[PDB]
């Protein structure tokens, strides 16, 4: 939430200009947009119709650069490192932060070995230095680092923009949660009604006990 409004102010300026730039002016625009060390969501610029007609011209490299930042990773960049333009150190640093977010989306305890492969570091100290000064202190995530088990827990992590093929899963995930909440309603209700039925049946049954002996007492007296 706290990270949302920080992008919100910058997004409005970005979308306002991007809605009006000519074909060439988007070139420098995308470079700074992916390099600002606050902006992590870019699909709003992607959804803006001006970039739709840019696909096809000589600036097509810029669009694929945006798509990588919209939904992509370091492993994806290395495979297609030829066509994509050379990135300044600031751009690379931003995408390394996005690496943790994607892995933190489908997991909560991140093993060390997975992190070294994706982030391309050498020893434990280099990896831990990156996490402290670029992930937790930036406010992107909030966790704790362990050294004996070599794992990094990620309780809170800001989500990323949806790649094509996630909204359908969101509805199923939400609907499944709704059904579990709903099925817990009648399940609770049945337990309460079960207590009433057993209590009433018992009190009627014990009532037949003393009435049985009350007749017995007077019969033999």
């Amino acid at each position: 939430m706290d990270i949302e409004q920080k992008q919100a102010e910058i997004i409005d300026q970005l979308v306002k200009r991007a809605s009006t730039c000519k074909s060439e002016a988007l070139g420098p625009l995308i470079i700074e947009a992916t390099s600002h060390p606050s902006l992590f969501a870019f699909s709003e610029i992607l959804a803006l119709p001006n970039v739709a007609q840019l696909e096809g011209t000589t600036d097509s490299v810029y669009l694929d650069l945006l798509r990588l930042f919209a939904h992509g990773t370091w492993g994806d960049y290395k495979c297609n490192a030829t066509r994509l333009p050379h990135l300044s150190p600031d751009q690379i640093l931003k995408l390394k932060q996005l690496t943790v977010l994607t892995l933190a989306e489908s997991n909560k305890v991140l093993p060390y070995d997975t992190l070294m492969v994706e982030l391309d570091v050498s020893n434990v100290r280099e990896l831990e230095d990156f996490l402290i000064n670029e992930c937790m202190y930036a406010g992107i995530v909030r966790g704790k680092l362990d050294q004996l088990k070599r794992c990094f827990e990620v309780p809170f992590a800001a989500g990323r923009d949806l790649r094509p093929g996630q909204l359908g899963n969101m509805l199923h995930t939400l609907s499944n949660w709704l059904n579990t909440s709903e099925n817990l309603l009648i399940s609770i209700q049945d337990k309460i009604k079960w207590a009433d039925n057993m209590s009433e049946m018992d009190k009627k049954h014990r009532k037949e006990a003393e009435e049985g002996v009350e007749e017995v007492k007077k019969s033999l007296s």
Partner: protein
């Protein structure tokens, strides 16, 4: 008396101008009351000869009036800086400089007492708060120092934040802070590896407790920039004095930064955060979207 001192200080002033502050201190020594005391104190403080002058200023402070444009408070603050050299009066001094900070912003004569003096006092007040240790009141005045002001423009901002917000202070940054810290060469005392070294490593170890859960002794040397044996020594007494919370082991050579609660209580925190985020989505959209 006063007439002899004025004539002697006139010769002292000429000596002080011509790189003879040592001769100026001897000659001068040998809010009208405050002004006379401040003139002797200022030369004494500048040449670090406040002996026999701080008491004289204090003796005249009883009869010292206020009048108009009293710079005696600044001289007392400078005297407090000499007090803060050894008596560690920075806690009172830092609040004093804040008084002479942009808090008292007005015409105030010229820019030497309303533009530059406040900026220097603001910078000085920040440094003194850092020098003091512990200080729940020091934490309290740290809040208002970071609280807007011009500190964001100030050059010491990085340190201030890293101090205010418990953050790991890297060795290269603390060297610059100590390097610039040369007010009277008493603050940077070399007495038993200084006190800033003991103060900085205390703070860096304090910030690492929240950030970690356990750490081997070998990696406690890379950060904190010290040999593992020394790091084990300071970590021992810090726990002994009930500063941080944790335990120490040697077979694996690790320190368990516990400072937490049971996983059931940790589980409850996740649930509370889970429900809290649910409310903000509805509240954020209902208020803004519609």
């Amino acid at each position: 008396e006063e007439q002899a001192l004025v004539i002697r200080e006139k010769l002292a002033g000429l000596y002080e101008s011509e790189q003879e502050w040592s001769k100026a201190a001897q000659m001068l020594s040998g809010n009208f009351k405050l002004s006379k005391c401040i003139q002797i104190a200022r030369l004494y403080l500048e040449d670090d000869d406040a002996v026999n002058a701080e008491a004289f200023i204090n003796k005249a402070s009883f009869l010292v009036s206020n009048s108009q444009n009293e710079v005696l408070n600044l001289q007392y603050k400078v005297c407090y800086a000499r007090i803060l050299d050894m008596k560690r009066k920075f806690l009172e001094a830092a609040l004093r400089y804040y008084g002479i900070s942009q808090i008292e912003q007005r015409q105030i004569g010229d820019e030497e007492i309303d533009e530059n003096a406040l900026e220097q006092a603001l910078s000085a007040a920040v440094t003194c708060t850092i020098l003091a240790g512990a200080g729940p009141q020091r934490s309290r005045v740290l809040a208002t120092l970071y609280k807007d002001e011009r500190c964001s423009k100030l050059k010491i901002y990085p340190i201030l934040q890293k101090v205010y917000l418990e953050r790991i202070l890297r060795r290269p940054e603390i060297d610059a802070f100590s390097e610039e810290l040369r007010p009277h060469q008493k603050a940077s005392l070399p007495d038993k590896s200084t006190v800033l070294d003991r103060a900085m490593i205390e703070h860096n170890l304090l910030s690492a407790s929240k950030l970690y859960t356990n750490i081997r002794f070998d990696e406690l040397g890379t950060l904190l920039a010290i040999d593992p044996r020394k790091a084990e020594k300071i970590a021992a007494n810090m726990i002994g004095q009930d500063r941080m919370r944790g335990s120490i082991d040697q077979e694996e050579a690790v320190i368990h930064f516990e400072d937490d609660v049971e996983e059931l209580q940790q589980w409850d925190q996740q649930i509370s955060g889970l429900c809290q985020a649910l409310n903000d989505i509805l509240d954020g959209m209902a208020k803004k979207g519609m």
